[PDB]
Amino acid sequence: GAMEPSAPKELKFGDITKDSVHLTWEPPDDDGGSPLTGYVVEKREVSRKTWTKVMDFVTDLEFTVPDLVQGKEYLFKVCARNKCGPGEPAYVDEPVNMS
Ligand SMILES: [Ca+2]
């Protein structure tokens, strides 16, 4: 419910490769009143409407997203979790392309 952390801050991507990107972020301002336990990473190709889980329960401020396809544009969103589930998502600023 409303025990939701705020969004992670400064979601950014770098270190692009043939098949991966490296996301980094900072902790949310509000943890929802319960300690943060991890982050959840989702992705979607820009032309599809569906978000897809990449990894949950990430205990870091970063994640290398694997198995990305050359020629596709991708979006990513990260949410912080606490014991009551994930909070509001942070979004990348622009899609990631591949080549
Ligand atoms: Ca680390």
Author numbering: 1 to 99
Show the paper's wording.
Titin is a giant, elastic, sarcomeric protein with a molecular weight of more than 3800 kD. Titin consists primarily of two types of protein domains: fibronectin type III (FnIII) domains and immunoglobulin (Ig) domains (ca 100 residues in length) that account for over 90% of its mass. Despite the repetitive composition of titin, a single main immunogenic region (MIR) has so far been identified in its chain that elicits the reactivity of almost all known anti-titin antibodies in MG patients. This 30 kD segment, also termed MGT30, consists of a domain triplet of composition Ig-FnIII-FnIII located in the titin segment at the junction of the I- and A-bands (I/A) and corresponding to domains 4 to 6 in this region of the chain, i.e., tandem I109-I111 also termed I/A4-I/A6,.
To gain an insight into the possible molecular determinants of I110 recognition by anti-titin antibodies, we elucidated the 3D-structure of the isolated I110 domain, the double tandem I110-I111 and the full-length MIR region I109-I110 using X-ray crystallography. Domain I110 also presented such typical features without detectable deviations. In fact, its structural comparison to FnIII domains from titin with known 3D-structure revealed a remarkable agreement: namely, RMSDCα values for superimpositions onto domains A77, A78 and A170 yielded values of 0.81 Å, 1.02 Å and 1.18 Å, respectively. The I110 domain showed a stable and same structure when isolated and arrayed with its neighboring domains. In the present study, we clearly showed that the single antigenic region of the titin MIR is its middle FnIII domain, I110. In another two Western blots, four more anti-titin sera and two HC were also tested with the same result. These results suggested that the antibody epitope in I110 is formed by a linear sequence motif and is not the result of a three-dimensional, spatial arrangement of amino acid residues with specific conformation. In brief, structural analysis did not lead to the identification of unique features in I110 that might support its unique recognition by anti-titin antibodies. An analysis of sequence conservation relative to FnIII used as negative controls in this study reveals a subset of surface residues unique to I110, that could mediate its specific recognition by anti-titin antibodies. The available crystal structures will support future studies that could resolve the role of these candidate residues in I110′s antigenicity and permit mapping their formation of epitope(s).
